[PDB]
RNA sequence: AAUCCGGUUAAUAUUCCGGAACCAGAAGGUGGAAUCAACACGGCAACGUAAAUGAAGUUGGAGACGUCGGCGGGAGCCCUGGGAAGAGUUCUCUUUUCUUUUUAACAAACCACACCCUGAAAUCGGUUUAUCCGGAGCUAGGGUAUGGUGUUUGGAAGAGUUCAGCGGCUGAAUCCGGUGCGCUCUCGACGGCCCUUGAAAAUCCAACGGAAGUGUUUUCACAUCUGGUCGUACUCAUAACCGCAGCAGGUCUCCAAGGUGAACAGCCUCUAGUUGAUAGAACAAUGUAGAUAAGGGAAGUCGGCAAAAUGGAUCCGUAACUUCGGGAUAAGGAUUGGCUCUAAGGGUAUCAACUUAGAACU
C-alpha cells in the first residue's frame, strides 16, 4: 500500500529491475544460450509473495 | 488524433469535469499539438476550448407549487402519506405553546398586570394544559382581573 | 432619482431600428407595478436625441429589466443574431455586433 | 497578522534591523495600507488621510526597501 | 508539540513555488518589572494584573473515556428577498430562467451554567419541552469565571471567480439582506438505563512545604539559531486486492444537492462519472423473465404450491381470551383530486413560517 516499509521498498525496487527484457547485444555473443528472459513477471499473473 | 489527455488537462485547468469540456472539432490539429497545461491555457484564451454551462434545473415549478401550497392547496387527505404526528409532532406543538404561554406570563408579571401569586397560579394552570392558546390565557387573565377587582 | 440610458448609435446609423420603435416598445411594455401604462411621475422615459433611450425613475428600477425588454423586441424582429446588448458603465447599455 | 495603530512604533519597527521590506497598498475605498515585512510578523498600518500617508512614506528611512502596489 | 491559503506538473504535493504562520529546544543580548521593608499590588469577595525567585519531599489535576433520549447555540450545505454582470427562452406569456456574487491557518480587541456579595423568603416563590431548586440563604439587585466553528479588523484582494476590451496588457464587478420541528458535523445544559457503571501509560501543569540567595532573581515584552531517518506515484475495485481470470462472488470506512413524500424508501433531475458487456438480421416450436383474460371460483394438488387480493393517511368502530401489560392496524365501515376561499394557531402598526378545521365550485 501507500504505507510501506523500507525493506519492502528495497524488495520491490530489485524485483522491478529484474523484470526487464534482455539487452540485444547479449544475444550476439558467441555461445550464447540466452534468447529471452526466463524470469519475466506481470503484476496480475504471478505475485511476488513478499 | 487522440485527445483524451487534452480533455483531461482542460478539465483540470478549467476546474470542471470532462462532461463540461468542449473542444473545437474544426481545430483538432492545433489541439493535438497542444500538449502541456500552458498550451491548454493558451487554447482556452484563444477560444478553442470552452467550458459548457451547467444543465438546466429551473425551480420555477417548484417555487410556484410551494407558493400555491402555502395558500392552503395540495394538503387534503389524499395528499398526505405520513401520519399526523410525523408531519407535525405534537411534541413541538406543545413546546411552542408552552414557551409562548410562559413568555406572555413573564411579560405580564414584569409589566404589573399580574403579581407573583397569580403568575404562579397561571403558570401551573398553563402547564396543566388548561390554556389552549394565547387568547384563552388572555381571556382567563382578564376574567380573573375583573373578578378580583 | 436613478438614471438609465440605452445607447443605440450603431442601430440608428445602420437603420437597424429607429428611436420611435425604441420609445414605443418601452412605453407599451414597461411593467411597473405589474401593469403597463402606470408610469405616473415616479418613472419617466425621457428620450433625448435620436440615438438615446433614457429612463429616469424616482423608485428602484433594474438595468437587468432594461436589458430584458431590449432583448424582447430584438428577437421579435428576428435580428438577435446580429445584435447583442452589453453594459459599458453604470446604468449604460449599448448594442454591439460581432 | 499584526495590525498596528501607532505611527511611531510602525516607524520604529521599520528602523529595527529585523525589517526587510515595506509595501504600499492603495485600496479603492481610498485608504492607504503600509505593510512592513519583518522577520517573524507582518506589521500593517491603515491610514485614512493621503497627506499623512505621504509624510509617513518620506519618514521611512532611505535604506528600507519600499515597494508599490503588487 | 506544531501549517494554512493561492498557485504550479504530462505525472508530485497540507511536502515543491509565492505569501502568511506555528511548535519544541538552546544561548547570551536589548527593553520593562521586583529587590537594603530580599522575594509586586488591587478587590468585602468570587478573582484580576505585563512581569511578581522556590531545592528536597508530598499531593492534586489534565491526558482520561459507556449508552440512549429530546432541548438550546454555532459552522458548512439547503431555502430565499433585492443589486450587478453575462448567458437561456421569447408566435404569445414571464420586472424571469440559469450561472457567478468567495475569504484559510494565525495574531489582536470584544462577547452571560458554576461562583461571590447585599438580602432574609408562607398570600411560599423561581423555573423547564422534560419538576427540579431554596433559611445548608429562594426570588430579586450588583458582580466574578469560562470565550469560539461568534463579532470587528489584520491576513486580504495584490488572491480566487465572473465580465467587457487591446496586442502579454488595460478596464469594470465581487453588493445588501431575511428564514427554519431542515440536513451534516460539533458544542452546551440536562434526562434515562444497568446484579452492565463503561482502559492504561508517556507527557504537561498546579499546589502544600521553605533548602538557598554593587549585586541579585524575572513562567514579562523583543529579536538570534536549529529541526535527522523512513513512508508519500497509482488502484482500493462489475479490470489494478482475494477467488486459476479483465469471475454477476467477497472485502473496513469518510463526504452526500433538489422535487415528490413521514422518510439516507421508491421514482425523476443538477454537480461528477459512464455510455462499458461481440454484433447484425429475422419473429418458428420449446423455453427464461414479465403482462392480461369471458363464465365459474381451489372443481387443480400430498398440500392454495405459485399467483392474486389487501396495502398510505384521516374519522368511526373493534371480539373471545388475558399473566390486566396485551390481543389490536383485531375484525368491520366511511373518506381522499383540482381550484377559489374564509376561520383560527405566532413575532415586533408592520414582519415571518406550514400545520390543521370548514365552505362552496368543478
Amino acid at each position: 500500500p501507500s504505507h510501506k516499509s523500507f525493506r519492502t521498498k528495497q524488495k520491490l525496487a530489485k524485483a522491478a529491475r529484474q523484470n526487464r527484457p534482455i539487452p540485444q547485444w547479449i544475444r550476439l555473443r558467441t555461445g550464447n544460450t540466452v534468447h529471452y528472459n526466463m524470469k519475466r513477471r506481470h503484476w496480475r499473473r504471478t505475485k511476488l509473495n513478499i | 488524433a487522440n485527445l483524451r489527455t487534452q480533455k483531461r488537462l482542460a478539465a483540470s485547468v478549467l476546474k470542471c469535469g470532462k462532461r463540461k469540456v468542449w473542444m473545437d472539432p474544426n481545430e483538432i490539429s492545433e489541439i493535438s499539438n497542444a500538449n502541456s497545461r500552458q498550451n491548454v491555457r493558451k487554447l482556452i484564451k484563444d477560444g478553442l476550448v470552452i467550458r459548457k454551462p451547467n444543465l438546466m434545473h429551473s425551480r420555477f415549478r417548484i417555487r410556484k407549487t410551494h407558493a400555491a401550497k402555502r395558500l392552503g392547496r395540495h394538503t387534503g387527505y389524499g395528499k398526505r402519506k405520513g401520519t399526523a404526528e410525523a408531519r407535525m409532532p405534537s411534541a413541538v406543538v406543545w413546546m411552542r405553546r408552552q414557551r409562548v404561554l410562559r413568555r406572555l406570563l413573564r411579560k405580564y408579571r414584569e409589566s404589573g398586570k399580574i403579581d407573583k401569586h397569580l403568575y404562579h397560579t397561571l403558570y401551573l394552570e398553563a402547564k396543566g394544559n388548561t390554556f389552549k392558546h394565547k387568547r384563552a390565557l388572555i381571556e382567563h387573565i382578564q376574567r380573573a382581573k375583573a373578578e378580583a377587582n | 432619482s436613478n438614471k438609465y440610458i440605452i445607447d443605440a448609435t450603431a442601430a440608428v446609423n445602420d437603420k437597424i431600428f429607429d428611436v420611435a420603435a425604441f420609445e414605443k416598445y418601452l412605453i407599451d411594455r414597461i411593467k411597473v407595478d405589474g401593469k403597463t401604462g402606470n408610469l405616473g411621475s415616479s418613472v419617466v422615459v425621457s428620450r433625448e436625441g435620436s440615438s438615446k433611450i433614457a429612463v429616469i425613475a424616482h423608485i428602484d428600477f433594474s438595468g437587468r429589466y432594461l436589458k430584458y425588454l431590449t432583448k424582447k423586441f430584438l428577437k421579435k424582429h428576428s435580428l438577435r443574431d446580429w445584435l447583442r446588448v452589453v453594459s459599458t458603465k453604470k446604468g449604460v447599455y449599448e448594442l454591439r455586433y460581432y | 497578522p499584526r495590525q498596528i495603530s501607532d505611527i511611531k512604533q510602525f516607524l520604529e519597527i521599520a528602523r529595527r534591523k529585523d525589517a526587510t521590506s515595506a509595501r504600499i497598498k492603495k485600496n479603492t475605498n481610498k485608504d492607504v495600507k503600509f505593510k512592513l515585512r519583518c522577520s517573524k510578523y507582518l506589521y500593517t498600518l491603515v491610514v485614512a488621510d493621503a497627506k499623512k500617508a505621504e509624510k509617513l512614506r518620506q519618514s521611512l528611512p532611505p535604506d528600507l526597501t519600499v515597494t508599490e502596489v503588487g
Side-chain angles (χ1 to χ4, degrees), chain B residues 64-102:
Chain B
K64 166 190 77 172
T65 304
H66 276 108
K69 170 200 63 192
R70 164 141 301 291
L71 301 168
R73 308 314 192 278
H74 299 278
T75 59
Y77 292 124
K79 292 293 184 183
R80 47 184 65 173
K81 300 189 74 186
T83 170
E85 201 70 6
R87 299 177 41 108
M88 163 65 47
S90 56
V92 306
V93 180
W94 175 255
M95 184 191 43
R96 277 149 152 136
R97 182 195 313 157
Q98 277 307 293
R99 287 180 188 169
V100 163
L101 293 187
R102 291 168 182 169

Side-chain angles (χ1 to χ4, degrees), chain C residues 6 22-40 43-45 53 55 57 61-62 65-70:
Chain C
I6 303 188
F22 287 115
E23 174 68 28
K24 296 288 99 175
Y25 194 41
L26 255 298
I27 203 61
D28 67 353
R29 295 293 288 276
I30 205 70
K31 300 145 193 173
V32 77
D33 322 69
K35 40 180 153 290
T36 191
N38 204 4
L39 280 302
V43 55
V44 171
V45 48
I53 291 297
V55 317
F61 204 60
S62 309
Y65 191 171
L66 271 283
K67 200 164 137 182
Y68 170 43
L69 291 183
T70 311

